[PDB]
């Protein structure tokens, strides 16, 4: 039916907007809203890619990404950070966690399309 994307996003409107962009591109989307849920979803299913928002409740993007990279198949899954502060706080935290790439919010549907193809076809 389509490639499987884990979208890790805590903000309700970004959840709506980014899930809609992904479903418009033909992806199957699993949405989770915090780092704890990201680590469990990744432990239990192979995803084609994970979109990891940097700032999350419970467990942040840095910690979730570290924990996924320590799992047997999270070791290799493409993880693309979503950053709204690619300019300071996130460069000095989330973006050092083991990301393949990052999107800067606010981003375009075409940018999302471009970055997923880059990694799912890498
Ligand atoms: Mg956030």
Author numbering: 513 to 634
Would you copy out the relevant sentences from the publication that reported this structure?
The recombinant PA1611REC protein comprises amino acids 507–651 of hybrid sensor histidine kinase PA1611 and contains the C-terminal receiver domain. The crystals of PA1611REC with Mg2+ belong to trigonal space group P3121 with one protein molecule in the asymmetric unit. In this (β/α)5 motif, the five-stranded parallel β-sheets, which are β1 (Glu516–Val520), β2 (Arg540–Val544), β3 (Ala561–Asp565), β4 (Ile591–Thr595) and β5 (Asp613–Ala616), are folded in the central core. The surrounding five α-helices are α1 (Pro524–Ser536), α2 (Gly547–Arg556), α3 (Gly573–Arg581), α4 (Gly601–Gln608) and α5 (Arg621–Trp631), among which two (helices α1 and α5) are located on one side, whereas the others (helices α2, α3 and α4) are on the opposite side. Previous studies have shown that the binding of divalent metal ions in the active-site cleft is essential to activate the receiver domain. The surface electrostatic potential around the active-site cleft of PA1611REC is highly negatively charged and suitable to accommodate metal ions [Fig. 7(a)]. The divalent magnesium ion (Mg2+) from the crystallization solution was found to be coordinated in the active-site cleft. The divalent magnesium ion (Mg2+) is hexa-coordinated, of which three positions coordinate with three water molecules, and three with the main-chain oxygen atom of Arg567 and the side-chain oxygen atoms of Asp522 and Asp565. The results suggest that our PA1611REC is in an inactivated form; there might be conformational changes that occur in the side chain of Thr595 and Tyr614 after phospho­rylation, similar to the residue substitutions in E. coli CheY and TMY.
